[PDB]
Structure formats: C-alpha cells, structure tokens
Design an enzyme around this catalytic site. Sequence first.
Site, short mmCIF file in Angstrom:
data_model
loop_
_atom_site.label_atom_id
_atom_site.label_comp_id
_atom_site.label_asym_id
_atom_site.label_seq_id
_atom_site.Cartn_x
_atom_site.Cartn_y
_atom_site.Cartn_z
N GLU A 35 -12.17 -0.01 0.24
CA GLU A 35 -13.17 1.05 0.08
C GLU A 35 -12.62 2.23 -0.71
O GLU A 35 -13.32 2.77 -1.57
CB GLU A 35 -13.69 1.52 1.43
CG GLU A 35 -14.53 0.49 2.17
CD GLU A 35 -15.89 0.25 1.56
OE1 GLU A 35 -16.29 0.99 0.63
OE2 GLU A 35 -16.57 -0.69 2.01
N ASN A 46 -23.76 6.04 -5.03
CA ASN A 46 -24.51 4.81 -4.88
C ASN A 46 -25.72 4.85 -5.80
O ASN A 46 -26.11 5.91 -6.30
CB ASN A 46 -24.97 4.65 -3.43
CG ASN A 46 -23.80 4.59 -2.47
OD1 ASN A 46 -22.85 3.84 -2.71
ND2 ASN A 46 -23.85 5.37 -1.40
N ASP A 48 -28.82 4.55 -5.16
CA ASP A 48 -29.96 5.29 -4.63
C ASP A 48 -29.75 6.80 -4.64
O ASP A 48 -30.61 7.52 -4.11
CB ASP A 48 -30.33 4.78 -3.23
CG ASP A 48 -29.32 5.18 -2.16
OD1 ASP A 48 -28.22 5.69 -2.48
OD2 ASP A 48 -29.64 4.99 -0.97
N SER A 50 -27.38 8.44 -3.02
CA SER A 50 -26.45 8.83 -1.97
C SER A 50 -25.02 8.71 -2.50
O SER A 50 -24.77 8.22 -3.60
CB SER A 50 -26.64 7.95 -0.74
OG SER A 50 -26.43 6.59 -1.08
N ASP A 52 -20.83 7.86 -1.14
CA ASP A 52 -19.88 7.41 -0.12
C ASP A 52 -18.65 8.31 -0.17
O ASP A 52 -18.13 8.60 -1.25
CB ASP A 52 -19.45 5.97 -0.39
CG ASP A 52 -20.53 4.97 -0.08
OD1 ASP A 52 -21.60 5.37 0.43
OD2 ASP A 52 -20.32 3.78 -0.35
N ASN A 59 -21.44 6.71 4.01
CA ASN A 59 -22.59 6.94 3.13
C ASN A 59 -23.44 8.13 3.59
O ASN A 59 -23.83 8.20 4.76
CB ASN A 59 -23.44 5.67 3.12
CG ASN A 59 -24.43 5.65 2.00
OD1 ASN A 59 -24.75 6.68 1.41
ND2 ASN A 59 -24.93 4.45 1.67
N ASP A 101 -23.42 0.22 15.39
CA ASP A 101 -24.85 0.32 15.11
C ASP A 101 -25.59 -1.01 15.15
O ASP A 101 -26.82 -1.01 15.04
CB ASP A 101 -25.10 1.08 13.79
CG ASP A 101 -25.13 0.16 12.56
OD1 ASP A 101 -24.46 -0.90 12.55
OD2 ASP A 101 -25.82 0.53 11.58
#
Length: 129
Positions: A35, A46, A48, A50, A52, A59, A101
């Site tokens: 990562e 990202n 969209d 957003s 990270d 995110n 989650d």
Amino acid sequence: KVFGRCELAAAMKRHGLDNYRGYSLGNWVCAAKFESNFNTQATNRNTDGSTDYGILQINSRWWCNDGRTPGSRNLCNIPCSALLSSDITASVNCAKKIVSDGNGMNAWVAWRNRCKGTDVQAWIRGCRL
Ligand SMILES: [Cl-]
Ligand SMILES: [Cl-]
Ligand SMILES: [Cl-]
C-alpha cells in the site's frame, strides 16, 4: 517516516495488530509494503476523488476527513492528516475498525491482489518479535 520492515512489524505488534481479526502480523506488514512502501506520508488519489492516506492507505471516502471528498464519511473520526504521522497509532486504530467491517483485509486492494494466499510470514522473517 519510511519504516524499516522489522521496525514496522514491531510497532504493529505493540499496537495489537498481530492476529487482529485473525490476520497474522505478516499480513499487515505485507499490506503496508504494497500500500505505502512503508512510508507514513504516502498519499494517492482515487478515481472517485477520494484520497488514500498513510502507511495503510486509508480512504477518505469512508474513514477520515480531508475536507475535499464531498459526500464522504469519517468513520474513524479523525482528520486524514493524522494518518500521515510518524507515529502509527491513528492508522492502526482506524485499520482495526476497517478490518472489522465485514470484508476483512479484502478492503485493502493491494493485500487481496499481492498478499492474500502468499507466504506472508516472509514479511516478518528474521525479525526479533
Ligand atoms: Cl505472519
Ligand atoms: Cl470532505
Ligand atoms: Cl476475515
């Protein structure tokens, strides 16, 4: 900060990531490797809009506030900049919420594509833990 491999393993273990939600320490170290390359200051945008952030590329769409992800959430209740600190506490605390989650470590695309099903032990091999 750019962590050493065993250095990060030790900090993740002290913060209780080893076997958290059943994921052994090498999984967390492998995920951080791919990562962020062990760099607490890593940021990546990202598609969209957003971003990270940090050692575990958390995110802004869901987990932290960066003020520039319109409509996103802040489920870890922290500024995304806190996930860039030299101290990994914020990132670990938030990672524990993510991995709880429902989807486990599959939330980290780099883990799914590059760590899952591999010999993740190798990432802690030779470390004094
Ligand atoms: Cl392991
Ligand atoms: Cl925002
Ligand atoms: Cl799981």
